[PDB]
Amino acid sequence: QTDGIYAAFDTLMSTAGVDSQIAALAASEADAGTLDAALTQSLQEAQGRWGLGLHHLRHEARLTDDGDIEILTDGRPSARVSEGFGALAQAYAPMQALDERGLSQWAALGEGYRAPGDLPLAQLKVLIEHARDFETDWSAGRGETFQRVWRKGDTLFVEVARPASAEAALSKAAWKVIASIKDRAFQRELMRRSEKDGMLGALLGARHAGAKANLAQLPEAHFTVQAFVQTLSGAAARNAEEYRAALKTAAAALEEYQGVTTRQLSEVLRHGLRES
Amino acid sequence: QTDGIYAAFDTLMSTAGVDSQIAALAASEADAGTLDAALTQSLQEAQGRWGLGLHHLRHEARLTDDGDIEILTDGRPSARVSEGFGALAQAYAPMQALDERGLSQWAALGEGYRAPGDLPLAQLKVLIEHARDFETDWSAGRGETFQRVWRKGDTLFVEVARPASAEAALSKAAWKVIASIKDRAFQRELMRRSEKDGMLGALLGARHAGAKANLAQLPEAHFTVQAFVQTLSGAAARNAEEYRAALKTAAAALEEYQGVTTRQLSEVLRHGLRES
């Protein structure tokens, strides 16, 4: 079952585009310290990517004594992997204040002034080059994306997000799945069902019950890629050119990773009908 | 001997235009806590006004076990009032980092970024409105003045200073005093003497033999008004017009207080010792 926990952690990390390699690393039978460090680093990256807004908490992941994996927030264990991925989502639930747009209203540095996202570029350049610490609120960018940026100590962070609840990403994958069906009778059946059950309810009802339960057990129903965070340090943390380069890089990373997740989800949904 | 302590404190605070009123406070049977609070408030005012560059340290003043007053800098007693004014001056000496112009080189927020001393006002307004914490270096103002500004949390500070070592202020006051002279021959002789003995000494050359010694025992022998700090809070701390108005207010207050010091010192030198 231990390799099961390793694989499950890898599955959850891959939903945020993190090549965890935890199974491959504990396959080398490394010490507890190395595995815990990898767990924590991967968890932090995935937290930055999922767009949960929890930059104001310190996220850690560690190996327990009974063979489970425990997640921790500010040193307080939130949940355990065996509890269930749905349990993990429900645990993180009250720790969020997402608005209608789906964007974290919590600040990253804690309490303090937050310049509005509408700030023109020049003022932002001044803040980056000369201010000490600061944070801007979300501002819309091309492609219906949103962006914010904040400096903590010597590290600048740029977050670019296009919110999509897990259900919405599954819906996008379902549209991609329907588009590719060639047996037109089945396609028309799904279209018939959609008008009342949503594209999702339709597609998922086309699956057999075992596939429905499997989906219920997967992480993809709760976690998907929603944002990317790029970090600069040192002098680069106070350079306008590097800031713009990092912003565009983060936008491209979001595009690429979201496309990858959509393809993966499309394949997962397809696998639920091939054997039905 | 107790009353002399409060009188000396009041006179020392009068060197910075701060009417301490500690003597009247202790006379009216105030608790030790109130005495301590008033002492520290007045001392911090005079510290912001003396232009010693030690805003980066928390100053305290308390009443001791033997009935004296003890001055502490970050908890370390520098000197007690009875020890003498020159004692306190030499105790303050080691922590100074005055440059060739006589202006503080120390930072005010501690380690961290500091804006340049030529930052265009357009960027400065952005900093005031939108940064969280910031501090600029000294930038020259009109009439040999110098100005700097910094925000800490919710409080914005603007300091305007013109360098003047105590002895330099005494010299300028003596210049005024001899300028008022009516007998041309006396004026010429005093001006001739100053070219060698220093103007202050030349003026003191016509008085009781006490003269120099008695003047050295006065507060002004080691303290003079070099700077003024104006503080804003709340939304005012993030308003450009308020910043400009506060800069003007601080400059005007500097001018007024330095003029009062000059006038009072000139008359004092005119009559002087009168030790009784």
DSSP string, A75-105: TEEEEEGGG-HHHHHHHHGGG----TT----
Chain B contact present for A134, CB below 8 A: yes
CB contact under 8 A, B127 and A132: no
- Minimum-distance CB partner of A112 among B109, B132, B134: B132
- Minimum-distance CB partner of B131 among A122, A134, A238: A134
- Cβ contacts (< 8 Å) between B119 and chain A: which residues? 130
One-letter amino acid of A252: A
User: Residue B71 burial (CB < 10 Å; 0-12/13-18/19+)?
Assistant: buried
Chain B contact present for A132, CB below 8 A: yes
Contacts of B158 (CB under 8 A, 6+ apart): B147, B148, B149, B229, B230, B231, B232, B243, B246, B247, B250
Cα–Cα distance, A184 to B84 (Å, whole number): 101
Task: Of B139, B144, B177, give the one whose Cα is nearest residue B267.
Answer: B177
A155 touches B152 (CB < 8 A): no
A119 touches A136 (CB < 8 A): yes
Q: How far apart are the first and last CA of chain A?
A: 29
Chain A contact present for B113, CB below 8 A: yes
Task: Of B262, B184, B254, give the one whose Cα is nearest residue B220.
Answer: B262
CB contact under 8 A, B119 and A133: no
Phi-psi region for residue B234, left (φ > 0), alpha (ψ -120 to 50) or beta?
A: left
Distances from the Cα of A132 to the Cα of A57, A129, A203, B233, angstroms: 21, 9, 52, 19
Q: Which of B109, B111, B113, B125 best probes binding to A when mutated, by most A CB atoms within 10 angstroms?
A: B113
B85 touches B70 (CB < 8 A): no
For residue B115, list its beta bridge partners.
B136
* Cα dihedral B128/B134/B136/B141 (nearest 10): 30
- Cβ contacts (< 8 Å) between B238 and chain A: which residues? 113
| Experimental technique | X-ray
Cα–Cα distance, A161 to A258 (Å, whole number): 11
Q: How many CA atoms lie within 13 A of A63 on its CB side?
A: 19
- Minimum-distance CB partner of B132 among A119, A126, A134: A134
Task: Of B58, B61, B49, B55, give the one whose Cα is nearest residue B17.
Answer: B49
CB contact under 8 A, A126 and B129: no
Phi-psi region for residue A19, left (φ > 0), alpha (ψ -120 to 50) or beta?
A: beta
Cα–Cα distance, B235 to B129 (Å, whole number): 9
Supply B263's token pair: 């006038």
Min distance B78 CA to chain A CA atoms (Å):
33
CB contact under 8 A, A123 and B112: no
Distances from the Cα of B183 to the Cα of B159, B189, B193, B211, angstroms: 42, 10, 16, 22
Contacts of A137 (CB under 8 A, 6+ apart): A114, A115, A116, A117, A148
DSSP 3-state assignment of A51? Answer: coil
Contacts of B44 (CB under 8 A, 6+ apart): B59
Q: How many CB atoms lie within 10 A of CB A120?
A: 8
DSSP 3-state assignment of A140? Answer: strand
Work out the angle between the directed axes of helices A32-50 and A2-14 (0-180°, nearest 10): 30
Cα–Cα distance, B42 to B24 (Å, whole number): 14
- Cβ contacts (< 8 Å) between B113 and chain A: which residues? 130-132, 238
